[PDB]
């Protein structure tokens, strides 16, 4: 009875992305269990060194959720991504920052 | 004080 759950990944900027304005990139990882989780932020595929996180917390279903975020200035040439890996997840997952709002 | 108790 170890159970398990799997992380849910969303890549979103705080403010509507506009080239030439300071904004943070957010990767929100939720729905996962156990607590240990390996998540990452990539600028054009290469590791970005400075990152922070929300304090480890869970929802009513006893499932952990974290938020990694890094300041940047958006531009049309630079592609961004988030890279998550877990005990449930085998090959490291990567999701791309997409223009929405 | 310790709250909760287990």
């Amino acid at each position: 009875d170890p159970i398990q759950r799997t992380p849910k990944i969303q890549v979103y900027s705080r403010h509507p992305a506009e080239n030439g304005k300071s904004n943070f990139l957010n990767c929100y990882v939720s729905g996962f269990h156990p607590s240990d989780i390996e998540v990452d932020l990539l600028k054009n595929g290469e590791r970005i060194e400075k990152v922070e996180h929300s304090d480890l917390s869970f929802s009513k279903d006893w499932s952990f959720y974290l938020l990694y975020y890094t300041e940047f200035t958006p531009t049309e040439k630079d592609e961004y991504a988030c890279r998550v890996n877990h005990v449930t997840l085998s090959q490291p997952k990567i999701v791309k920052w997409d223009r929405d709002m | 004080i310790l709250r909760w108790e287990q």
Binding site: I3, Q4, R5, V87, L89, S90, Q91 | -
Partner: protein
């Protein structure tokens, strides 16, 4: 303005792992008919990346593959203002892997008269919604729900026995399936 219809299939198989090239082809409608493909829900970006020379032949090559290519696809021809065909989208293009190995759990012996209907069991320690049984891999696969509400569990040819595969996925991402299970087929 006689209404035609195309036919869609993937080359080969309906189930592909990561990094494995698979070609999506839809045929008419003679040659060279002007085909157009699209993906439901999220828009498939690489459809513009495939050269129109091949697009008019159908056969969307998709060199290698990624998890983003997974989804439902539909092919039609004629666009508007002149004529159009009704598109058929039976296929669900699925990528397998990126998740944990689902566990195989069996009732009595795998070799019986085979006219016993079909009864298997496929568990997983993780909590996923759907479980997929691939026999051949016309006949391909079938999708199934969990048995119990809380736990993730699902209960389910004398001459030539087909293959066997089980998969597990979260229903919100139906086209991302876990890694291919252990082989319960003949080998």
């Amino acid at each position: 303005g006689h209404l035609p219809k195309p036919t869609l299939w993937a080359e080969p198989g309906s189930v592909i792992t990561q990094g494995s090239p698979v070609t999506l082809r839809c045929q008419g409608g003679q040659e060279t008919q002007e085909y157009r493909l699209y993906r439901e829900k999220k828009t498939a970006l690489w459809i513009t990346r495939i050269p129109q020379e091949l697009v008019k032949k159908g056969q969307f090559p998709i060199p290698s593959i990624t998890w983003e290519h997974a989804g439902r696809y539909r092919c039609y021809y004629g666009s508007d203002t002149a004529g159009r065909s009704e598109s058929s989208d039976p296929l669900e293009l699925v990528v397998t892997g990126a998740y944990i190995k689902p566990t195989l759990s069996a009732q009595p012996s795998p070799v019986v008269n085979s006219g016993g209907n079909v009864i298997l069991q496929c568990d997983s320690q993780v909590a996923f919604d759907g479980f997929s049984l691939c026999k051949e891999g016309h006949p391909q696969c079938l999708n199934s729900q969990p048995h119990a509400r809380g736990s993730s569990r699902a209960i389910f040819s004398p001459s030539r026995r087909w293959w066997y595969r089980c998969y597990a996925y979260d229903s919100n991402s139906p086209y991302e399936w876990s890694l291919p299970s252990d082989l319960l087929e003949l080998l």
